[PDB]
C-alpha cells in the first residue's frame, strides 16, 4: 500500500513577533518537501530527487501555498488563545496532519485530516468526510464554524481527487525508488549478561519501508513479555534499522528463533545463532 | 500538493 502524508506545525513565540511555521511532506516513508517560516529565505525546499526535476513554477506555487497557510495558522493560534482565554505570555503549539492512503485497486482507500492543540487532540475529520469530531467544548465552536462555512466539502474535494492525482504522478515520476522494496539485511549477535545468562539480539538493517515485524519465539512460544523492543530508526540514507533482544539461559539458545516479517522478503524469515 | 483551497482559519 502507498500513501501521502502532510504535517504542519505552528509554534507561537510571544514577545518575539510572529510564530514559527514548519511544514513537511512524506510520500510513504521518504521526505520530498519541507518549508520553514523562520528560514533565511523562506521557500519550498526539495529533499527527494524526483521533485527536484519539477518545474520552478511548481515550487513558486507550493511556496505560496505554505506562506498562506502560515498566515492562516498565526490567526488560528490567536483564535485558539481567545477560545481558551489563556494568557498571551504562554507558548502554544498547533499541529495539523492530513493525508490519503491509496487502495489496492489503484483508487482512494482512506483519507485523514486532523488538528491538535498542545499535544492534545483538538478536532478530526470523520471517515465519512462529511462530518467532524470535536474533542472538547471549544472544538465544537470550530465545528460550528466549519459546518456552517462548509469546509468539509473543500477537504473532501482535496482528499478524493487532487491528492490521488499528485500521489500517482509522484509514484510514476519516482517508481525506481518509491515502488522498490529493499529486503532487510539481518543477523543475530549475543553478549554475556552473567556467567549463566546471555542476551540474544536479532538485527535488521537496510530495509524500505520502515514497517517491519521482529518477534522472538521459544520453540514455538511467541511471548512479547520478555522481549525487548526499540522504535524503528532511520539510518539517514532513506533506510531504517530495528533490533529485538531477549535474555536467555545458556544452553537453551538452540530452542529460540527470531522471526522477521517484511514486504521485501517473499516469505517470513526464521533466524537462529 | 498541499491543501491550499480555502482559508482553514479555526
Amino acid at each position, epitope marked *: 500500500s502507498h500513501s501521502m502524508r502532510y504535517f504542519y506545525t505552528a509554534v507561537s513565540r510571544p514577545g518575539r513577533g510572529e510564530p514559527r511555521f514548519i511544514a513537511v511532506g512524506y510520500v510513504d516513508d521518504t521526505q520530498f518537501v519541507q518549508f520553514d517560516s523562520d528560514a533565511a529565505s523562506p521557500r519550498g525546499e526539495p529533499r527527494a530527487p524526483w521533485v527536484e526535476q519539477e518545474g520552478p513554477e511548481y515550487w513558486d506555487r507550493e511556496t505560496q501555498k505554505y506562506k498562506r497557510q502560515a498566515q492562516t495558522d498565526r490567526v488560528s493560534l490567536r483564535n485558539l488563545r481567545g477560545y481558551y482565554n489563556q494568557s498571551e505570555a504562554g507558548s502554544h503549539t498547533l499541529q495539523r496532519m492530513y493525508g490519503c492512503d491509496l487502495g489496492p485497486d489503484g483508487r482512494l482507500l482512506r483519507g485523514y485530516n486532523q488538528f491538535a492543540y498542545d499535544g492534545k487532540d483538538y478536532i478530526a475529520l470523520n471517515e465519512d468526510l462529511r462530518s467532524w469530531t470535536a474533542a472538547d467544548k471549544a472544538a465544537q465552536i470550530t465545528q460550528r464554524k466549519w459546518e456552517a462555512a462548509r469546509e468539509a466539502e473543500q477537504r473532501r474535494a482535496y482528499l478524493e481527487g487532487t491528492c490521488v492525482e499528485w500521489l500517482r504522478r509522484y509514484l510514476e515520476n519516482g517508481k525506481k525508488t518509491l515502488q522498490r522494496a529493499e529486503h532487510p539485511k539481518t543477523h543475530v549477535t549475543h553478549h554475556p549478561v552473567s556467567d549463566h545468562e546471555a542476551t540474544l539480539r536479532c538485527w535488521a538493517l537496510g530495509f524500505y519501508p520502515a514497517e517491519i515485524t521482529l518477534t522472538w519465539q521459544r520453540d514455538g512460544e511467541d511471548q512479547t513479555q520478555d522481549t525487548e523492543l526499540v522504535e524503528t530508526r532511520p539510518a539517514g540514507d532513506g533506510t531504517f534499522q530495528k533490533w529485538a533482544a531477549v535474555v536467555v539461559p545458556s544452553g537453551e539458545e538452540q530452542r529460540y528463533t527470531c522471526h522477521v516479517q517484511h514486504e521485501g522478503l517473499p516469505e517470513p524469515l526464521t533466524l537462529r545463532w | 500538493g498541499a491543501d*491550499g483551497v480555502g482559508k482553514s482559519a479555526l
Partner: T-cell receptor
Amino acid sequence: EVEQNSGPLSVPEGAIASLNCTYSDRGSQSFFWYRQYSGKSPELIMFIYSNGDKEDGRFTAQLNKASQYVSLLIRDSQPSDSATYLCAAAMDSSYKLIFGSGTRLLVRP
Amino acid sequence: GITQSPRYKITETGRQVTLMCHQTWSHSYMFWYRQDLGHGLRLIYYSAAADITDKGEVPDGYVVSRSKTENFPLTLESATRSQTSVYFCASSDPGTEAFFGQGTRLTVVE
C-alpha cells in the same frame, strides 16, 4: 478555457430551467455559479468542488467531472430570478478563477 | 468590503487612466475583469498575495502592480476605442467564493 451555455433562454411558466457549462482544461476541482442583474455586480448562489450533487433551497447542482458538464438548475421560476448567469472555475494549481460566457435568462409572466 | 474607485469615467484616446481597487476582507487573491457582452466576462490580470501578478486571457494593453496586500490598481497606458467596457475588481481566497465591487463603467471617446 470554459464555454458556458451562451444561447439565451426564456421559460414563461414557473417550471424547471436548466443550464450547464463545459471546460476544456480538465484540471479545475473548483466550480461556482454566479448571478448578475443588469447593471449590478454578480452574486454567488452555489459553489461546488465534489462530484456529488448538492441541494440548496430552490436550487441544485452536480459535477460528473468525466463528462465535466456542470449543471445548476431551479425548482420553480419567478420573474425576479431572471438575470444573467455566469459559470466559473478555478484551476487547482494557479487558483486563477475564470468565468464563462454569460447565459441571459428572461422570464415571461 | 470591497470598493472600486471610479463608478463612471470618460477619457480621450491616448491618455492613460488608472482604476483603484480596495478590499477590507484581506483576501489573498485579487483579479480584474472586463465585461462588454461580446464574449461574456473575461479576465485581464490576477494577482495572488502581494508583489506577484500573472496574466489572463486579455492582458495586452493593460498594466498592473501589487505593492500592498489590499490594493490592486489597474492602469491603461494608452486608452483606445476597444477598451471601452465595464470593469470589475474581484477578491477572494484561493477556492472560496469571489467578491467584487460595484464595477467601473468606462468609455473612451475620440
